[PDB]
């Protein structure tokens, strides 16, 4: 039990670090795609091509 719990905790810490790094990495391309996403959203809430 204790090894299972220790292994789970270690992998949880490692996964937290790795996934946090991966998320902020991908947020970079997120801020690129945001421009097009917002343009198309505007062209929807307006009902005509922006």
């Amino acid at each position: 039990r204790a090894q299972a719990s220790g292994e789970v905790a270690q992998t949880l810490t490692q996964a937290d670090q790795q996934l946090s790094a991966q998320g902020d990495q991908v947020r970079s391309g997120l801020e690129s795609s945001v421009d097009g996403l917002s343009a198309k959203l505007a062209s929807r809430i307006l009902g005509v091509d922006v």
Binding site: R1, Q3, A4, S5, E7, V8, T11
Partner: protein, 49 residues
């Protein structure tokens, strides 16, 4: 008197035999309980990870 002495010897032999039948049962048990507790340990470890 001779019959009682022979019966006592037979009773001691039968006590040695049940000591055998206590070892045969107890070792097999201890082994089986160890097996099921190891299986339980493995199952809970697998469940937790």
């Amino acid at each position: 008197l001779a019959d009682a002495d022979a019966m006592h010897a037979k009773a001691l032999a039968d006590a040695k035999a049940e000591s055998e039948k206590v070892t045969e049962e107890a070792k097999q048990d201890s082994e089986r309980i160890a097996a099921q507790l190891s299986e339980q340990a493995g199952s809970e470890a697998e469940r937790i990870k």
